[PDB]
Homo-oligomer: A and B are copies of this chain.
Amino acid sequence: SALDNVQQINDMINTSISQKEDGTAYFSDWLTKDRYKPKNQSQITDKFTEYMKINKDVESIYTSDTEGHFTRYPDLQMPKGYNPIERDWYKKAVENKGKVVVTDPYRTASTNTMVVTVVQQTKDGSGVVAINMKIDELLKSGYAFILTKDKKVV
């Protein structure tokens, strides 16, 4: 009963994150060294615009190549000193050698908003692509409501 309910909710969450994995899988193939050239930046923005406008549960989509050429939709002003290559989303993607990762919750550099990030290094290793979801919007992924006892799993 109560366990049936929590498992529906847990399925709604992992389905949502699994759909984001389909986004990073596509961009992992499409994003190449060639696409990271400055003259091609409008192509990345156009594809990110499409992705965001059809996925109304998404906070943002962004990529960096290995040189820190960073593209985000929406195109917010990033803080002075922002370095995508030094963020854990980027490092964890590179660590997983092209396998998709789902991060712990953290606050964005851009707005200090609490998000989960689905992130993946590109097939050719030229970059990392990432999709943010606000915790608030969300409510294999590794996320689940689980019975606890003084915050201890049972």
Contact = CB atoms under 8 A, between A and B. Distances in A.
Interface string A22-56: 11011000100000000000000001001101111
A26 B25 CA distance: 22
A114 B70 CA distance: 44
**Contact size class for A?**
10 to 19
Interface of A is mostly: helix
Contact of A23 (B19, B25, B30, B54): B54
Contacts of A22: 53-56
A128 B110 CA distance: 38
Contacts of A19: 54
A51 B55 CA distance: 11
A22 B51 CA distance: 11
A75 B9 CA distance: 37
A54 B56 contact: no
Interface of A: 19, 22-23, 25-26, 30, 47, 50-51, 53-56
Given A19-B54, A22-B53, A30-B50, 13 more contacts: A22-B54, A22-B55, A22-B56, A23-B54, A25-B53, A26-B50, A26-B53, A26-B54, A47-B50, A50-B50, A50-B51, A51-B54, A54-B54
